[PDB]
Amino acid sequence: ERKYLELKSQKNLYLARLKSAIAAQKIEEIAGNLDNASASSLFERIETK
Amino acid sequence: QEAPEDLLERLLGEMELELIELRRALAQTIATFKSTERQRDAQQLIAQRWYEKAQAALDRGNEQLAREALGQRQSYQSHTEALGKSLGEQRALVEQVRGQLQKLERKYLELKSQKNLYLARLKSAIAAQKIEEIAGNLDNASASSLFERIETK
Amino acid sequence: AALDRGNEQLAREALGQRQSYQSHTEALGKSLGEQRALVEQVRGQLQKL
Amino acid sequence: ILELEAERELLNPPPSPLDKKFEQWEEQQAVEATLAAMKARRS
Amino acid sequence: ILELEAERELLNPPPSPLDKKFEQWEEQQAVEATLAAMKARRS
Numbered sequence: 001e002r003k004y005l006e007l008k009s010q011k012n013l014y015l016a017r018l019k020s021a022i023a024a025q026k027i028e029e030i031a032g033n034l035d036n037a038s039a040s041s042l043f044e045r046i047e048t049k
Numbered sequence: 050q051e052a053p054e055d056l057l058e059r060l061l062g063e064m065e066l067e068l069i070e071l072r073r074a075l076a077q078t079i080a081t082f083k084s085t086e087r088q089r090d091a092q093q094l095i096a097q098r099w100y101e102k103a104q105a106a107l108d109r110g111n112e113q114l115a116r117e118a119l120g121q122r123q124s125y126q127s128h129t130e131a132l133g134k135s136l137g138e139q140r141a142l143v144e145q146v147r148g149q150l151q152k153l154e155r156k157y158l159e160l161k162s163q164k165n166l167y168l169a170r171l172k173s174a175i176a177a178q179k180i181e182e183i184a185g186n187l188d189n190a191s192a193s194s195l196f197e198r199i200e201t202k
Numbered sequence: 203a204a205l206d207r208g209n210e211q212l213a214r215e216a217l218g219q220r221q222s223y224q225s226h227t228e229a230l231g232k233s234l235g236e237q238r239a240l241v242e243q244v245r246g247q248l249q250k251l
Numbered sequence: 252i253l254e255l256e257a258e259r260e261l262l263n264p265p266p267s268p269l270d271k272k273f274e275q276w277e278e279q280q281a282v283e284a285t286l287a288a289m290k291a292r293r294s
Numbered sequence: 295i296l297e298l299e300a301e302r303e304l305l306n307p308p309p310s311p312l313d314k315k316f317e318q319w320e321e322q323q324a325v326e327a328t329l330a331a332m333k334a335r336r337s
Contacts, residue, residue: 019070019074027064030060030064045053
């Protein structure tokens with residue numbers, strides 16, 4: 001019983017980290033789509049026109 | 050594909066979803082350590098009351114009894130040291146990620162800030178092209194200008 | 203008031219807190235000056251048009 | 252209880268320790284400087 | 295975790311050690327030079 005509660009205790013902490021990572025990947029992956037990349041960034045299309 | 054300008058507003062729309070999704074994930078992280086922190090306080094309090102007994106245990110010459118009580122305390126101490134060290138480590142996790150969100154939110158608003166400024170420029174350009182493209186149709190061109198047709202007749 | 207009465211140590215952090223806002227001040231301040239050229243030039247266009 | 256109180260920390264960040272010493276440091280003068288004028292005022 | 299954090303390193307290269315010493319070196323003056331004016335300002 002002492003071990004299980006400790007095992008269940010850590011479960012959420014790494015679930016929280018897991019949700020942080022997906023929130024870290026999906027936030028910046030789209031971020032570079034605008035202008036942060038050298039090429040293919042949609043921002044340069046505006047200047048092209 | 051859809052109009053790129055429409056995607057700009059729509060794209061930042063999902064950006065907002067992640068920020069709130071990120072925020073909730075943070076809070077859950079913040080929620081747990083206090084639960085662990087409170088749990089530590091209870092155990093050391095359980096250790097303290099054993100010390101309170103240890104104060105009275107060996108008093109009046111019953112040293113033998115106090116030995117077991119401290120032997121009972123070390124078990125709770127082991128939890129105290131293990132959990133105590135873990136809590137200190139968890140502090141680095143929460144502190145570092147909060148700075149991230151602070152960095153991300155500062156960046157996003159600046160990103161959204163510029164969006165309109167270049168949208169305005171974009172609308173200026175189309176207003177610059179469509180205004181003069183038709184302008185030359187009348188007389189400004191050397192040939193094919195409809196103005197010369199009047200003189201021809 | 204920070205460094206007044208001999209608490210120079212405290213004032214150092216406060217200025218360290220100010221530089222972060224200054225960085226925004228310089229970056230945004232320079233951008234605003236640039237944006238003035240954009241608006242002024244386009245207004246003359248409309249006047250010409 | 253721990254779930255919701257955490258959200259208060261998020262939407263409403265608490266005063267930092269740097270500012271915490273302000274309303275104690277400048278207040279230690281907002282009390283001393285204020286009472287200094289009052290102390291001198293009577294005399 | 296290690297999979298995704300690596301991609302952040304790619305799309306967003308981190309500050310170089312050469313620039314890292316800048317916001318500490320020029321900041322050591324952005325603090326000293328700034329406080330130098332403040333230090334001289336009071337006196």
